[PDB]
Protein backbone atom coordinates (compact mmCIF):
# COMPACT_ATOMS: atom_id res chain seq x y z
CA UNK A 1 0.00 0.00 0.00
CA UNK A 2 1.00 3.64 -0.36
CA UNK A 3 0.95 5.79 2.77
CA UNK A 4 2.02 9.35 3.52
CA UNK A 5 4.66 9.57 6.25
CA UNK A 6 6.95 12.04 7.94
CA UNK A 7 10.45 11.42 6.64
CA UNK A 8 13.84 13.07 6.38
CA UNK A 9 14.18 15.50 3.47
CA UNK A 10 16.98 15.39 0.91
CA UNK A 11 20.26 17.18 1.57
CA UNK A 12 19.76 19.51 -1.40
CA UNK A 13 16.19 20.22 -0.31
CA UNK A 14 17.59 21.11 3.11
CA UNK A 15 20.32 23.27 1.55
CA UNK A 16 17.78 25.28 -0.47
CA UNK A 17 15.83 25.77 2.77
CA UNK A 18 18.99 27.15 4.37
CA UNK A 19 19.26 29.47 1.39
CA UNK A 20 16.03 31.40 1.92
CA UNK A 21 17.30 32.01 5.44
CA UNK A 22 20.16 33.92 3.79
CA UNK A 23 18.46 35.14 0.61
CA UNK A 24 17.38 38.38 2.29
CA UNK A 25 20.68 38.77 4.14
CA UNK A 26 23.42 36.50 5.48
CA UNK A 27 21.78 33.97 7.72
CA UNK A 28 22.27 31.55 10.54
CA UNK A 29 20.71 28.27 9.42
CA UNK A 30 19.72 25.95 12.26
CA UNK A 31 19.01 22.22 12.03
CA UNK A 32 17.45 20.24 14.87
CA UNK A 33 18.94 17.06 13.45
CA UNK A 34 22.67 16.75 14.01
CA UNK A 35 25.25 17.15 11.26
CA UNK A 36 26.46 13.57 11.65
CA UNK A 37 22.85 12.41 11.45
CA UNK A 38 22.47 14.65 8.40
CA UNK A 39 25.19 12.95 6.34
CA UNK A 40 23.87 9.46 7.10
CA UNK A 41 20.08 9.89 7.02
CA UNK A 42 19.58 12.50 4.26
CA UNK A 43 19.76 11.55 0.59
CA UNK A 44 21.68 13.94 -1.65
CA UNK A 45 18.77 14.54 -4.06
CA UNK A 46 15.17 13.65 -3.27
CA UNK A 47 13.70 10.64 -5.04
CA UNK A 48 11.34 11.49 -7.94
CA UNK A 49 7.69 11.47 -6.90
CA UNK A 50 6.97 9.38 -10.01
CA UNK A 51 9.06 6.65 -8.39
CA UNK A 52 7.13 7.18 -5.14
CA UNK A 53 3.49 6.90 -6.27
CA UNK A 54 2.35 3.32 -7.05
CA UNK A 55 2.61 2.36 -10.71
CA UNK A 56 -1.01 1.19 -10.63
CA UNK A 57 -1.89 4.59 -9.16
CA UNK A 58 0.03 6.30 -11.96
CA UNK A 59 -2.00 4.29 -14.47
CA UNK A 60 -5.34 5.04 -12.80
CA UNK A 61 -4.52 8.76 -12.68
CA UNK A 62 -3.65 8.56 -16.38
CA UNK A 63 -6.94 6.73 -16.98
CA UNK A 64 -8.68 9.61 -15.23
CA UNK A 65 -6.65 11.59 -17.77
CA UNK A 66 -8.08 9.13 -20.35
CA UNK A 67 -4.59 8.86 -21.84
CA UNK A 68 -4.93 6.59 -24.86
CA UNK A 69 -1.96 4.46 -23.81
CA UNK A 70 0.59 4.63 -21.01
CA UNK A 71 3.33 4.21 -23.62
CA UNK A 72 2.05 6.69 -26.22
CA UNK A 73 2.27 9.16 -23.34
CA UNK A 74 5.56 11.11 -23.16
CA UNK A 75 7.27 11.26 -19.74
CA UNK A 76 10.73 11.97 -18.25
CA UNK A 77 11.33 8.96 -15.97
CA UNK A 78 10.32 5.39 -16.98
CA UNK A 79 8.56 2.67 -15.21
CA UNK A 80 8.87 -0.47 -17.30
CA UNK A 81 6.46 -1.03 -20.19
CA UNK A 82 5.39 -4.48 -19.01
CA UNK A 83 4.69 -3.26 -15.48
CA UNK A 84 2.42 -0.52 -16.83
CA UNK A 85 0.57 -3.06 -18.98
CA UNK A 86 0.36 -5.35 -15.95
CA UNK A 87 -1.22 -2.52 -13.97
CA UNK A 88 -3.78 -2.05 -16.75
CA UNK A 89 -4.53 -5.78 -16.63
CA UNK A 90 -4.61 -5.49 -12.84
CA UNK A 91 -7.19 -2.68 -12.89
CA UNK A 92 -9.25 -4.47 -15.55
CA UNK A 93 -9.46 -7.56 -13.34
CA UNK A 94 -10.91 -5.37 -10.58
CA UNK A 95 -13.58 -3.99 -12.91
CA UNK A 96 -11.92 -0.57 -12.67
CA UNK A 97 -10.86 -0.78 -16.33
CA UNK A 98 -12.87 -1.90 -19.35
CA UNK A 99 -11.69 -4.30 -22.04
CA UNK A 100 -11.39 -1.23 -24.28
CA UNK A 101 -8.98 0.28 -21.67
CA UNK A 102 -11.44 3.10 -20.89
CA UNK A 103 -11.88 3.95 -17.22
CA UNK A 104 -15.14 2.59 -15.84
CA UNK A 105 -17.50 4.59 -13.66
CA UNK A 106 -16.20 2.63 -10.68
CA UNK A 107 -12.77 3.12 -12.23
CA UNK A 108 -13.23 6.87 -11.91
CA UNK A 109 -14.03 6.61 -8.20
CA UNK A 110 -10.98 4.44 -7.43
CA UNK A 111 -9.00 7.19 -9.15
CA UNK A 112 -10.53 9.76 -6.78
CA UNK A 113 -9.70 7.77 -3.64
CA UNK A 114 -6.17 8.59 -2.40
CA UNK A 115 -5.66 4.97 -1.39
CA UNK A 116 -4.27 2.22 -3.59
CA UNK A 117 -6.61 0.98 -6.36
CA UNK A 118 -6.88 -2.47 -4.78
CA UNK A 119 -7.66 -0.89 -1.41
CA UNK A 120 -9.75 1.80 -3.12
CA UNK A 121 -12.12 -0.83 -4.56
CA UNK A 122 -12.60 -1.95 -0.96
CA UNK A 123 -13.68 1.53 0.03
CA UNK A 124 -16.38 1.22 -2.64
CA UNK A 125 -17.79 -2.22 -1.73
CA UNK A 126 -17.17 -1.64 1.99
CA UNK A 127 -20.51 0.15 2.50
CA UNK A 128 -22.80 -2.85 2.08
CA UNK A 129 -25.34 -4.08 4.64
CA UNK A 130 -23.79 -2.09 7.52
CA UNK A 131 -20.43 -3.85 7.06
CA UNK A 132 -18.61 -0.54 6.58
CA UNK A 133 -17.04 -0.32 10.09
CA UNK A 134 -15.45 -3.73 9.47
CA UNK A 135 -13.94 -3.31 6.00
CA UNK A 136 -12.18 -0.28 7.44
CA UNK A 137 -11.10 -2.45 10.38
CA UNK A 138 -9.83 -5.13 8.00
CA UNK A 139 -8.21 -2.59 5.68
CA UNK A 140 -6.52 -0.78 8.56
CA UNK A 141 -5.13 -4.10 9.80
CA UNK A 142 -3.97 -5.15 6.33
CA UNK A 143 -1.93 -2.00 5.69
CA UNK A 144 -0.47 -1.81 9.20
CA UNK A 145 0.39 -5.52 9.32
CA UNK A 146 -0.25 -8.59 11.45
CA UNK A 147 -0.30 -7.82 15.21
CA UNK A 148 -0.04 -11.51 16.12
CA UNK A 149 3.23 -13.14 17.20
CA UNK A 150 3.93 -16.68 16.00
CA UNK A 151 4.51 -19.46 18.52
CA UNK A 152 7.78 -20.34 16.79
CA UNK A 153 8.98 -16.74 17.17
CA UNK A 154 8.06 -16.56 20.87
CA UNK A 155 10.04 -19.70 21.70
CA UNK A 156 7.21 -21.03 23.89
CA UNK A 157 7.66 -24.40 22.17
CA UNK A 158 6.89 -23.38 28.44
CA UNK A 159 4.34 -25.91 27.18
CA UNK A 160 1.58 -24.20 29.16
CA UNK A 161 2.37 -20.96 27.33
CA UNK A 162 1.58 -22.83 24.11
CA UNK A 163 -1.83 -23.82 25.48
CA UNK A 164 -2.61 -20.20 26.35
CA UNK A 165 -1.21 -19.28 22.94
CA UNK A 166 -3.46 -21.90 21.34
CA UNK A 167 -6.44 -20.68 23.36
CA UNK A 168 -5.57 -17.16 22.23
CA UNK A 169 -5.34 -18.34 18.62
CA UNK A 170 -8.69 -20.07 19.14
CA UNK A 171 -10.50 -17.01 20.52
CA UNK A 172 -9.29 -15.06 17.50
CA UNK A 173 -11.23 -17.36 15.18
CA UNK A 174 -14.53 -17.78 17.04
CA UNK A 175 -15.93 -15.20 14.62
CA UNK A 176 -14.97 -17.02 11.39
CA UNK A 177 -13.84 -20.64 11.44
CA UNK A 178 -12.07 -20.84 8.07
CA UNK A 179 -10.86 -17.25 7.48
CA UNK A 180 -7.66 -15.64 8.74
CA UNK A 181 -8.51 -11.98 8.10
CA UNK A 182 -11.80 -12.22 9.98
CA UNK A 183 -10.30 -13.84 13.06
CA UNK A 184 -8.02 -10.80 12.99
CA UNK A 185 -11.08 -8.58 12.55
CA UNK A 186 -12.55 -10.20 15.66
CA UNK A 187 -9.30 -9.27 17.44
CA UNK A 188 -8.75 -5.69 16.26
CA UNK A 189 -12.42 -5.21 17.07
CA UNK A 190 -12.09 -7.16 20.33
CA UNK A 191 -9.56 -4.83 21.99
CA UNK A 192 -11.95 -1.94 21.28
CA UNK A 193 -14.50 -3.34 23.74
CA UNK A 194 -11.66 -4.20 26.13
CA UNK A 195 -11.01 -1.33 28.59
CA UNK A 196 -7.92 0.84 28.27
CA UNK A 197 -6.73 -0.16 31.74
CA UNK A 198 -6.92 -3.87 30.83
CA UNK A 199 -5.66 -3.47 27.25
CA UNK A 200 -2.05 -4.26 28.18
CA UNK A 201 -3.11 -7.49 29.88
CA UNK A 202 -5.25 -8.34 26.85
CA UNK A 203 -2.20 -7.43 24.77
CA UNK A 204 -0.02 -9.84 26.77
CA UNK A 205 -2.55 -12.69 26.85
CA UNK A 206 -2.87 -12.65 23.05
CA UNK A 207 0.77 -11.64 22.36
CA UNK A 208 -0.29 -8.41 20.63
CA UNK A 209 2.03 -5.48 19.98
CA UNK A 210 0.57 -2.68 22.07
CA UNK A 211 1.88 0.00 19.72
CA UNK A 212 0.81 -1.51 16.41
CA UNK A 213 -2.89 -1.28 17.31
CA UNK A 214 -2.89 2.41 18.30
CA UNK A 215 -1.87 3.15 14.72
CA UNK A 216 -4.65 0.79 13.60
CA UNK A 217 -7.04 2.58 15.96
CA UNK A 218 -5.82 5.93 14.65
CA UNK A 219 -5.75 4.68 11.06
CA UNK A 220 -9.34 3.40 11.06
CA UNK A 221 -10.53 6.88 12.05
CA UNK A 222 -8.66 8.36 9.10
CA UNK A 223 -9.87 5.71 6.66
CA UNK A 224 -13.51 5.93 7.76
CA UNK A 225 -13.37 9.72 7.40
CA UNK A 226 -11.99 9.40 3.86
CA UNK A 227 -14.73 6.94 2.91
CA UNK A 228 -17.43 9.07 4.54
CA UNK A 229 -16.08 12.05 2.62
CA UNK A 230 -15.99 10.23 -0.72
CA UNK A 231 -19.35 8.46 -0.41
CA UNK A 232 -21.22 11.59 0.70
CA UNK A 233 -21.60 14.65 -1.50
CA UNK A 234 -20.99 16.93 1.51
CA UNK A 235 -17.58 15.33 1.78
CA UNK A 236 -16.12 18.02 4.05
CA UNK A 237 -19.27 18.28 6.18
CA UNK A 238 -19.05 14.65 7.28
CA UNK A 239 -17.06 14.21 10.49
CA UNK A 240 -15.59 11.08 12.07
CA UNK A 241 -17.73 9.59 14.84
CA UNK A 242 -16.27 7.22 17.41
CA UNK A 243 -19.64 5.44 17.42
CA UNK A 244 -19.22 5.02 13.66
CA UNK A 245 -15.87 3.35 14.34
CA UNK A 246 -17.74 1.23 16.89
CA UNK A 247 -19.13 -1.92 15.25
CA UNK A 248 -21.72 -4.59 16.07
CA UNK A 249 -21.15 -8.31 15.53
CA UNK A 250 -21.81 -9.52 11.95
CA UNK A 251 -24.52 -11.86 10.78
CA UNK A 252 -23.68 -15.01 8.83
CA UNK A 253 -25.15 -13.32 5.75
CA UNK A 254 -22.88 -10.36 6.49
CA UNK A 255 -19.91 -12.73 6.73
CA UNK A 256 -20.68 -14.02 3.23
CA UNK A 257 -20.96 -10.42 2.04
CA UNK A 258 -17.73 -9.63 3.88
CA UNK A 259 -16.13 -12.62 2.15
CA UNK A 260 -17.23 -10.94 -1.09
CA UNK A 261 -15.60 -7.64 -0.17
CA UNK A 262 -12.40 -9.58 0.60
CA UNK A 263 -12.56 -11.12 -2.87
CA UNK A 264 -13.08 -7.84 -4.75
CA UNK A 265 -9.85 -6.49 -3.25
CA UNK A 266 -7.63 -9.42 -4.20
CA UNK A 267 -9.55 -10.97 -7.07
CA UNK A 268 -6.26 -11.74 -8.78
CA UNK A 269 -4.69 -13.28 -5.66
CA UNK A 270 -7.13 -16.20 -5.50
CA UNK A 271 -6.10 -19.85 -5.76
CA UNK A 272 -7.98 -23.13 -6.08
CA UNK A 273 -6.74 -26.40 -4.66
CA UNK A 274 -4.36 -27.93 -7.16
CA UNK A 275 -6.04 -31.30 -6.59
CA UNK A 276 -9.45 -29.75 -7.28
CA UNK A 277 -8.38 -28.37 -10.66
CA UNK A 278 -6.54 -31.63 -11.48
CA UNK A 279 -8.10 -34.45 -9.44
CA UNK A 280 -5.69 -37.40 -9.14
CA UNK A 281 -2.89 -35.54 -10.98
CA UNK A 282 -1.04 -35.04 -7.68
CA UNK A 283 -1.56 -37.50 -4.84
CA UNK A 284 -3.38 -35.88 -1.91
CA UNK A 285 -5.17 -37.25 1.14
CA UNK A 286 -6.34 -36.18 4.58
CA UNK A 287 -3.06 -37.46 6.05
CA UNK A 288 -1.22 -34.81 4.04
CA UNK A 289 -1.21 -31.66 6.16
CA UNK A 290 -2.47 -28.36 4.80
CA UNK A 291 1.17 -27.42 4.27
CA UNK A 292 1.27 -30.44 1.95
CA UNK A 293 -1.99 -29.60 0.17
CA UNK A 294 -1.19 -27.53 -2.98
CA UNK A 295 -2.97 -24.57 -4.57
CA UNK A 296 -2.68 -22.82 -7.95
CA UNK A 297 -3.88 -19.29 -8.82
CA UNK A 298 -6.15 -18.73 -11.81
CA UNK A 299 -3.97 -15.77 -12.81
CA UNK A 300 -0.76 -17.79 -12.45
CA UNK A 301 0.86 -19.06 -15.63
CA UNK A 302 0.64 -22.76 -16.42
CA UNK A 303 4.03 -24.39 -15.87
CA UNK A 304 5.68 -27.46 -17.45
CA UNK A 305 5.84 -29.10 -14.00
CA UNK A 306 2.64 -28.97 -11.95
CA UNK A 307 4.47 -28.49 -8.64
CA UNK A 308 5.92 -25.20 -9.89
CA UNK A 309 2.39 -23.80 -10.12
CA UNK A 310 1.52 -25.36 -6.76
CA UNK A 311 1.35 -23.01 -3.77
CA UNK A 312 0.74 -24.07 -0.17
CA UNK A 313 -0.97 -22.63 2.90
CA UNK A 314 0.75 -21.18 5.95
CA UNK A 315 1.05 -23.15 9.23
CA UNK A 316 0.09 -20.21 11.47
CA UNK A 317 -3.10 -19.88 9.42
CA UNK A 318 -6.02 -21.43 11.31
CA UNK A 319 -7.18 -23.39 8.26
CA UNK A 320 -3.94 -25.34 8.59
CA UNK A 321 -4.36 -26.27 12.27
CA UNK A 322 -8.10 -26.99 12.19
CA UNK A 323 -7.24 -30.43 10.81
CA UNK A 324 -10.15 -30.38 8.35
CA UNK A 325 -10.11 -30.55 4.58
CA UNK A 326 -9.66 -27.00 3.21
CA UNK A 327 -12.27 -25.41 0.92
CA UNK A 328 -11.86 -25.41 -2.83
CA UNK A 329 -11.08 -21.72 -3.52
CA UNK A 330 -8.64 -19.82 -1.26
CA UNK A 331 -7.74 -16.15 -1.52
CA UNK A 332 -4.47 -14.63 -0.31
CA UNK A 333 -3.20 -11.13 0.48
CA UNK A 334 0.32 -11.96 -0.70
CA UNK A 335 2.29 -14.94 -1.93
CA UNK A 336 5.38 -15.53 0.22
CA UNK A 337 8.20 -16.97 -1.88
CA UNK A 338 10.09 -18.20 1.19
CA UNK A 339 10.53 -21.97 1.16
CA UNK A 340 11.93 -23.83 -1.83
CA UNK A 341 10.17 -27.07 -0.87
CA UNK A 342 6.77 -25.34 -0.63
CA UNK A 343 5.77 -21.76 -1.40
CA UNK A 344 3.97 -20.15 1.54
CA UNK A 345 0.44 -18.67 1.28
CA UNK A 346 -1.52 -16.52 3.74
CA UNK A 347 -5.25 -16.69 2.96
CA UNK A 348 -7.66 -14.03 4.19
CA UNK A 349 -10.82 -16.09 3.84
CA UNK A 350 -12.60 -18.82 1.90
CA UNK A 351 -14.67 -17.69 -1.09
CA UNK A 352 -17.44 -19.83 -2.56
CA UNK A 353 -17.99 -20.65 -6.23
CA UNK A 354 -21.05 -18.65 -7.29
CA UNK A 355 -20.13 -15.71 -5.02
CA UNK A 356 -16.65 -15.74 -6.58
CA UNK A 357 -18.43 -15.25 -9.89
CA UNK A 358 -20.07 -12.21 -8.25
CA UNK A 359 -16.71 -10.55 -7.80
CA UNK A 360 -16.18 -11.92 -11.30
CA UNK A 361 -19.36 -10.39 -12.75
CA UNK A 362 -18.06 -7.01 -11.62
CA UNK A 363 -14.55 -7.69 -12.89
CA UNK A 364 -13.39 -8.61 -16.36
CA UNK A 365 -11.85 -11.97 -15.42
CA UNK A 366 -15.03 -14.00 -15.90
CA UNK A 367 -15.71 -15.63 -19.27
CA UNK A 368 -19.22 -16.89 -20.04
CA UNK A 369 -19.91 -19.69 -22.51
CA UNK A 370 -22.91 -20.26 -24.75
CA UNK A 371 -26.32 -21.39 -23.45
CA UNK A 372 -26.85 -25.13 -23.15
CA UNK A 373 -29.51 -27.42 -24.65
CA UNK A 374 -30.72 -30.17 -22.33
CA UNK A 375 -33.54 -31.37 -20.13
CA UNK A 376 -35.11 -28.39 -18.41
CA UNK A 377 -32.30 -26.16 -19.72
CA UNK A 378 -34.33 -24.12 -22.22
CA UNK A 379 -33.60 -20.41 -22.66
CA UNK A 380 -36.38 -17.87 -22.21
CA UNK A 381 -36.31 -15.21 -24.95
CA UNK A 382 -38.52 -12.32 -23.83
CA UNK A 383 -37.33 -9.89 -26.53
CA UNK A 384 -35.02 -10.43 -29.53
CA UNK A 385 -32.05 -8.99 -27.63
CA UNK A 386 -32.55 -10.36 -24.07
CA UNK A 387 -32.81 -13.90 -22.69
CA UNK A 388 -32.62 -15.95 -19.48
CA UNK A 389 -30.61 -19.18 -19.37
CA UNK A 390 -27.93 -21.10 -17.51
CA UNK A 391 -24.34 -20.48 -18.66
CA UNK A 392 -21.13 -22.12 -17.47
CA UNK A 393 -18.66 -19.35 -16.45
CA UNK A 394 -14.89 -19.87 -16.51
CA UNK A 395 -12.94 -17.55 -14.23
CA UNK A 396 -9.84 -15.90 -15.64
CA UNK A 397 -8.24 -17.94 -18.39
CA UNK A 398 -10.52 -19.81 -20.79
CA UNK A 399 -10.12 -23.44 -21.83
CA UNK A 400 -8.97 -22.47 -25.32
CA UNK A 401 -5.89 -20.54 -24.14
CA UNK A 402 -3.50 -22.87 -22.30
CA UNK A 403 -0.76 -20.33 -21.54
CA UNK A 404 -2.41 -19.45 -18.22
CA UNK A 405 -4.01 -21.95 -15.85
CA UNK A 406 -7.63 -21.21 -14.97
CA UNK A 407 -10.50 -23.01 -13.27
CA UNK A 408 -14.10 -23.36 -14.45
CA UNK A 409 -17.05 -22.35 -12.27
CA UNK A 410 -20.25 -24.36 -12.14
CA UNK A 411 -23.09 -23.13 -14.40
CA UNK A 412 -25.47 -20.54 -12.93
CA UNK A 413 -28.71 -19.00 -14.18
CA UNK A 414 -28.25 -15.59 -15.79
CA UNK A 415 -30.00 -12.89 -17.81
CA UNK A 416 -28.20 -12.00 -21.07
CA UNK A 417 -28.78 -9.05 -23.43
CA UNK A 418 -26.97 -8.67 -26.76
CA UNK A 419 -24.64 -5.67 -27.10
CA UNK A 420 -22.31 -5.26 -30.09
CA UNK A 421 -23.12 -8.86 -31.02
CA UNK A 422 -22.10 -10.37 -27.65
CA UNK A 423 -24.55 -10.87 -24.80
CA UNK A 424 -23.52 -8.96 -21.68
CA UNK A 425 -24.17 -10.22 -18.16
CA UNK A 426 -27.12 -8.19 -16.84
CA UNK A 427 -27.46 -10.30 -13.68
CA UNK A 428 -27.40 -13.91 -12.58
CA UNK A 429 -30.97 -15.14 -12.16
Amino acid sequence: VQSFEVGWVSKASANQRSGRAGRTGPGHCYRLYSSAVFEHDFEQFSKPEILRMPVESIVLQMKSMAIHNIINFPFPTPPDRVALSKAIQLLQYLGALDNKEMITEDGKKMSLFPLSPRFSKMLLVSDEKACLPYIVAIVSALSVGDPFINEFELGINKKELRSKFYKSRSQFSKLDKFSDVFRLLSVVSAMDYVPKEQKEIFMKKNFLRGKLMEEIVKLRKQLMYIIKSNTSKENIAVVIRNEDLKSDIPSVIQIKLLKQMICAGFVDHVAVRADVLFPDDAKITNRTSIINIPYIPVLATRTPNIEDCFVYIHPTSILNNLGEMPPKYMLYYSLHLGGNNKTRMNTLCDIASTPLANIARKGLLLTYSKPLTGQGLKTVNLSPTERYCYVVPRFGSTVDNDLKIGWDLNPIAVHQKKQKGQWTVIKFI
Binding site: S186, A190, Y193, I249
Partner: peptide, 4 residues
Amino acid sequence: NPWL
Protein backbone atom coordinates in the same frame (compact mmCIF):
# COMPACT_ATOMS: atom_id res chain seq x y z
CA ASN B 1 -17.63 -8.88 25.60
CA PRO B 2 -19.13 -10.65 22.56
CA TRP B 3 -15.96 -10.58 20.46
CA LEU B 4 -14.51 -12.45 23.44
